Amino acid sequence: NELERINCIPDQPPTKATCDQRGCCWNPQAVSVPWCYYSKNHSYHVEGNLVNTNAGFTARLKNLVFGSNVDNVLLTAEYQTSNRFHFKLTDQTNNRFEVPHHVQSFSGNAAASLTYQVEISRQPFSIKVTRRSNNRVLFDSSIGPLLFADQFLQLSTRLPSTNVYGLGEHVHQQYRHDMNWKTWPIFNRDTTPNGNGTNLYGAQTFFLCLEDASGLSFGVFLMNSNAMEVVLQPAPAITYRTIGGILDFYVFLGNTPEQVVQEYLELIGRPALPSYWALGFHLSRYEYGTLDNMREVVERNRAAQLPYDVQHADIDYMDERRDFTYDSVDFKGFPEFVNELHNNGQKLVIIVDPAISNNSSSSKPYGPYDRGSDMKIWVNSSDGVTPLIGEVWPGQTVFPDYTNPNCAVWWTKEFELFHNQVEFDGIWIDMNEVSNFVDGSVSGCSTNNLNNPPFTPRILDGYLFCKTLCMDAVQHWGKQYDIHNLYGYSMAVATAEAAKTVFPNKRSFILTRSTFAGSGKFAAHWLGDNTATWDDLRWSIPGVLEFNLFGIPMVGPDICGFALDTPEELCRRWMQLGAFYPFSRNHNGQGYKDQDPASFGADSLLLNSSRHYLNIRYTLLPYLYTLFFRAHSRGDTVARPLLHEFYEDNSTWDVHQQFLWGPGLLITPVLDEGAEKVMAYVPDAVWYDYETGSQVRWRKQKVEMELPGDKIGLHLRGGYIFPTQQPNTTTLASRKNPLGLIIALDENKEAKGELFWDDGETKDTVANKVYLLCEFSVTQNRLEVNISQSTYKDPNNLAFNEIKILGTEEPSNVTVKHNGVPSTSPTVTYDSNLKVAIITDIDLLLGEAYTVEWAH
Ligand SMILES: O=S(=O)([O-])O[C@@H]([C@H](O)C[S@+]1C[C@@H](O)[C@H](O)[C@H]1CO)[C@@H](O)CO
Numbered sequence: 001n002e003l004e005r006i007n008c009i010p011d012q013p014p015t016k017a018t019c020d021q022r023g024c025c026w027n028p029q030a031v032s033v034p035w036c037y038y039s040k041n042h043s044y045h046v047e048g049n050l051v052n053t054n055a056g057f058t059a060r061l062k063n064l065v066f067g068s069n070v071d072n073v074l075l076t077a078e079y080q081t082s083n084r085f086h087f088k089l090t091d092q093t094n095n096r097f098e099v100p101h102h103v104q105s106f107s108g109n110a111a112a113s114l115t116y117q118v119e120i121s122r123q124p125f126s127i128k129v130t131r132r133s134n135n136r137v138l139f140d141s142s143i144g145p146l147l148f149a150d151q152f153l154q155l156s157t158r159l160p161s162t163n164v165y166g167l168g169e170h171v172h173q174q175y176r177h178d179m180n181w182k183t184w185p186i187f188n189r190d191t192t193p194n195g196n197g198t199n200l201y202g203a204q205t206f207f208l209c210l211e212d213a214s215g216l217s218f219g220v221f222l223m224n225s226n227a228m229e230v231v232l233q234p235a236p237a238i239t240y241r242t243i244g245g246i247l248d249f250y251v252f253l254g255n256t257p258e259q260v261v262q263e264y265l266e267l268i269g270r271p272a273l274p275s276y277w278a279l280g281f282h283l284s285r286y287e288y289g290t291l292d293n294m295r296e297v298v299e300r301n302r303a304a305q306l307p308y309d310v311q312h313a314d315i316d317y318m319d320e321r322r323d324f325t326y327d328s329v330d331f332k333g334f335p336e337f338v339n340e341l342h343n344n345g346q347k348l349v350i351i352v353d354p355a356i357s358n359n360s361s362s363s364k365p366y367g368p369y370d371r372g373s374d375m376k377i378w379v380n381s382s383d384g385v386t387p388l389i390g391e392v393w394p395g396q397t398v399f400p401d402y403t404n405p406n407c408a409v410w411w412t413k414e415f416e417l418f419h420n421q422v423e424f425d426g427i428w429i430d431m432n433e434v435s436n437f438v439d440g441s442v443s444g445c446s447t448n449n450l451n452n453p454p455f456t457p458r459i460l461d462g463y464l465f466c467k468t469l470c471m472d473a474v475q476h477w478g479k480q481y482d483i484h485n486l487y488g489y490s491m492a493v494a495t496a497e498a499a500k501t502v503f504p505n506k507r508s509f510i511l512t513r514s515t516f517a518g519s520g521k522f523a524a525h526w527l528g529d530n531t532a533t534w535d536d537l538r539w540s541i542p543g544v545l546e547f548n549l550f551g552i553p554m555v556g557p558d559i560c561g562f563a564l565d566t567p568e569e570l571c572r573r574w575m576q577l578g579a580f581y582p583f584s585r586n587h588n589g590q591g592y593k594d595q596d597p598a599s600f601g602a603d604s605l606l607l608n609s610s611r612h613y614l615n616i617r618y619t620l621l622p623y624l625y626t627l628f629f630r631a632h633s634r635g636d637t638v639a640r641p642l643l644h645e646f647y648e649d650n651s652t653w654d655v656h657q658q659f660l661w662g663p664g665l666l667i668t669p670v671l672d673e674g675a676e677k678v679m680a681y682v683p684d685a686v687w688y689d690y691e692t693g694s695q696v697r698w699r700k701q702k703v704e705m706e707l708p709g710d711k712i713g714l715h716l717r718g719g720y721i722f723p724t725q726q727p728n729t730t731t732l733a734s735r736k737n738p739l740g741l742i743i744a745l746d747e748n749k750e751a752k753g754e755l756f757w758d759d760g761e762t763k764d765t766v767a768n769k770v771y772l773l774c775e776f777s778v779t780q781n782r783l784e785v786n787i788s789q790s791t792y793k794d795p796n797n798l799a800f801n802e803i804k805i806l807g808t809e810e811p812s813n814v815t816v817k818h819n820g821v822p823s824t825s826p827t828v829t830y831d832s833n834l835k836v837a838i839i840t841d842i843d844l845l846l847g848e849a850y851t852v853e854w855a856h
């Protein structure tokens, strides 16, 4: 079976002599089927018996090209929970680099009631994880060898299906991985997210596999921060091939795909609950140039009444692109503008780069450099004593070593000092791969096994130190070779630590470019420097879905496209979709035509449609916020693939041009130039048009959805109750408004929903239980508002003043009881054609239990 051959010459075009040299098999009978492949027996074997331990078992593995092979390998397996299996493969005799991650070591006894069983084979070594309930083989290394050299470690697994989702950071273009022969390199790199499928800004080894239509799913995570590649083949099978550290694997079983994400996030860390304001709309560009220009853009979008919470300021606010300064001429009056923003209920987020100008003297001192030098907190060259010099925006630079706890002290004080001048509200950390305009350093990199390893994965440009730091550079956590992929992660950890001081008791907002597994505990993510093309629009959906799997649910691209002038039609469709990315920001590159919504004209279709859909986003913010609460507390996704709700239906398995907000809201954008319709899949559920309330005819079928220039498809799922709040142009204001309920009835006239409500900004409202959690349930004739947690009463005296019911016969004699005690008659408006009832003249106070009853 050619589909099962594991490639033995991953480094060069295949030849018989090399193959012979490697003791592999040769069979040149493509495309991509390996000509040279590992023999069926020629790997590691178990030495002696396995050893029962308290956590699981250990085995000793012994071996009979890419550096020193490790002769004796220790397998350590731990039955951590009923649904999480952990195994490490280490050097029996030498300690090796391991990621200094949230994840703690396991000091436990083996969990009870396992959903999985593990089987080890001895001659040759293989590891298999099967699901106990149906003996479905989930992990199975037997397809390939274990390879364990100092700078080349490889393990493969067969997969039980081709329903495979995950890996990053890349532009995959499709959400489902085909399992056609494909190699995905992972090594944090500043590169364009384009159709080339290169390594991008972040490193995410997690994948999820939907096993079958029952929903049974599993996930695999590799805890490894060295450059690596993930090799996919049609067996189906996946191979991990890394150039350092150890093979430290976790396997997660769930009954559903969402349960798999929850298991993964339980291990690596669930996402931060964002500030409610950060759910609003964000506007930004590279190079307004002057404060006057920035204010002009701010004012025209406010004039247009655009829902608009946050303004970002990019490196043009700085004095010559230097951190923690502003330009006293072009940005003269920045403090008064920040007061203006605040007074208008808006927030300022500032960009902050890691790299710190080293240009400092008696004449013109640069404080951040002087103070950081005093603290000795920079990344050093291999000599371990001289700060590494590279180049970024301000010129020659040194780079903070965020892995050193003293650096976060330095960093905090810098933000403290700057915040005294410019009262920013959130922080955008960029260029933190880390990105270097020179290769390695201003003196390049020394030739050695770190900078020039035996094997290099197929990373962009084919050198590790390309546009980053020397691999032999030295930080508190180790050498750059091992911790390069942790730069952005440690930076976000440190920036969150700074936020503890700058915004006491607040969440604030942190947006990061580079990430590692677990970055979502600290920061939001955006998909980087995209381009104003229809390709980039389409590619954004899988990227958003993937980051939700990764526990970074607040994710979005640069709406309308960073690079290039945006066509009006593309920007209009992108704003329409953009009103529904979990992170919604319009951002633009240097020099390009303006693409802020109001720049298209005060009476333009793009402005009108933008305002219209942003008003729907803001209306649905209580529902979106409640989704982020579930993501934070339980590990649920926010932007969700259809297959997560509809896995029983194999027509959902590669849908990637549509997605859900949580379980209940279906989003169908137009993603094709010139189009006024879209080919869409309608899952097996009752659906209601959001704007009209009318039940679609469609069910479990492909349709051509008619969507003119001012429309994006939005459908509400029957069985669900959506809390709403009357929109306004800021969430400061919107949070004071009356609330509503949209009850989308299922075929049985029933629905369920919930609402999380806290102060929208205090850190640890969830850990300290200072919040409201209520549940809504509808049966025929009755709505029940039930209160499950009631330790926060909003002092704005909020109430539900409207209930809209979809797919209903006329409700008559509506009664509102506050524990069996009625209170006068609400007004009911009924549309008998559309089957929509709207209950108004009602005053259901937030946090109070009610029963609303009717007859037919
Ligand atoms: O095309 S480019 O502008 O020159 O792209 C460069 C940066 O990634 C852009 S940064 C991130 C983006 O969101 C901010 O607006 C930009 C200013 O801080 C790379 O070329 C540097 O290697």
Ligand SMILES: *[C@@H]1O[C@H](CO)[C@@H](O)[C@H](O)[C@H]1NC(C)=O
Binding pocket: 376, 378, 379, 380, 384, 385, 386, 387, 401, 474, 475, 476
């Ligand atoms: C970097 O160099 C300074 C001396 O210049 C030293 O104090 C510091 O600990 C070094 N950092 C690392 C990570 O080795």
Ligand SMILES: *[C@@H]1O[C@H](CO)[C@@H](O)[C@H](O)[C@H]1NC(C)=O
Binding pocket: 345, 726, 727, 728, 729, 733, 734, 737
């Ligand atoms: C919206 O907020 C503005 C304050 O900017 C306020 O004047 C107005 O009353 C608010 N109205 C709504 C729709 O809540």
